[PDB]
Protein: 3C-like proteinase nsp5
Amino acid sequence: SGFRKMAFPSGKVEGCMVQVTCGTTTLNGLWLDDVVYCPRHVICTSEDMLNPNYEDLLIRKSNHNFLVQAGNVQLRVIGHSMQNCVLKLKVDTANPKTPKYKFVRIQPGQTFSVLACYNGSPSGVYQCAMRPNFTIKGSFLNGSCGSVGFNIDYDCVSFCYMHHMELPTGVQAGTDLEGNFYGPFVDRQTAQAAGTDTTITVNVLAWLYAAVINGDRWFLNRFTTTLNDFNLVAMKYNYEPLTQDHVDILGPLSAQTGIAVLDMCASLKELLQNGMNGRTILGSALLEDEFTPFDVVRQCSGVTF
Amino acid sequence: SGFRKMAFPSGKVEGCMVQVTCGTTTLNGLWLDDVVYCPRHVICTSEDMLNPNYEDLLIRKSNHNFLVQAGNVQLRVIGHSMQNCVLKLKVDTANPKTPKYKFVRIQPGQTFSVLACYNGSPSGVYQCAMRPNFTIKGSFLNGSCGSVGFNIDYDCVSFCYMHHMELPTGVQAGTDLEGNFYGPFVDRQTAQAAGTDTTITVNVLAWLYAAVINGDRWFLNRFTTTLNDFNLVAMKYNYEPLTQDHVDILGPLSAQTGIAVLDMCASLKELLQNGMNGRTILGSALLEDEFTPFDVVRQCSGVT
Structure:
């Protein structure tokens, strides 16, 4: 028993992290086969970042402007190109540690592991959720850019995130590995509005089920509710509306615990309306929304890789 | 900016995890050089765990009774021995993925990363603290036994923990890599007293400094205090007494923030006495004590 925010083992990704330097700027790159992926803003100076014409800036750059380092080994850049907001640096050597991988665009409310790096060296690993407003509440200092997010499905590493920037509000924004930003954000140093950040309702419920499975059941009430009536209450507290798809996803957890989803919703309703009265659930004094139903199942069944 | 509970990259440890089987029992082992380390209770059945004579049980066993599997590769066991509560199985092949490593016995209140495994395969990774009462609040299912805890200092992996059991209270107990239990716990299925779990005061303070560094400053009051007077308040709320060594450790964070340690103590004093009034600090509604001062510095300076 016990329940923790848990990241995927990072070994397969560690072997793909490199250092990319262009001028003064140094950040992280992902080395898969004979290609290094990094944020395209590596080519910019602090001034350029205000209003960069990336096409024009990229034209001025040559292969020899890009210093790519894997540990102590220096890779030879034999070509460079731009796919949306990601730079693809072609190198002469294929990464022999390249794992079975895919690029996926993940949905808001889904989770992934982030391998935080600095100068191409892995620093740490932690589990993140893509917020409904397409930001991430991560931990990123200067030179953390190009650190990637991933899931591991059996043998396959599914890269889903690359960090590009911190917004003035102190949250992070990034792209998928095809270089399309999550949300409305762009890779320029201007004021960008993050939207209203709602709570991921389906995740909170999954966490409540995890609580029950681990013998934390104090919040279980006698009441039930309907989807409609629950969502009325959810809207008030800036919770994602709950759909039947969401209800369906929770089925396995419902079946394990013997607690119907709508009964759990009624428990959640009371917690939102009355608070926790200074109690905890799984050692937390607020409702956690960064565990998916699949995360809870994964942890409670003990799936390995 | 931003501040997260962060584990060390697990790659170097993943290459050392193996499956150890003895009879019906299967659990995890640590393969370093030509030696495999695992919990000695691998030799026990469910019945035996009530009151095991490990010496006697071990006598019945021979080298060939220990099945050691690394991925698909089966290792040949050429010797076995018992060191405290750990089994040391000598194998014919040195682990070619053996990193630079050390065995360390960590102090209560220090942190480490745990690589949770099942049947010798890595499942996940998370950051833990050794509680003052020598337990850990982890996440361990059946067959998670032998999963290890570690720190990484530049190139060197410092193994500090091996999981042995869950206590009836739902927390975990284990040993260092020489097989000595942290705290008073033993490897038998009996009721064992966990003891009062105090809060790691120096860690809470480090976290408060991290909060300030990330611009979360609402809890900063006008008051100050003394060590003695603070500790009087600490004792009341089951907080570890704060020492001058603790004060000294916080110096870099004090210097970065411009907030004297005793001023921070006074802020903490008010939070203990008045609560948080339903507010948060770094996205948490309670005081976090599983970040060391080193952890905070590591994250805020961006060490690899």
Summary: The CA atoms of residues 278 and 285 of chain A lie 7 Å apart. The domain at 11-91 of chain A is CATH 2.40.10.10 (Thrombin, subunit H).
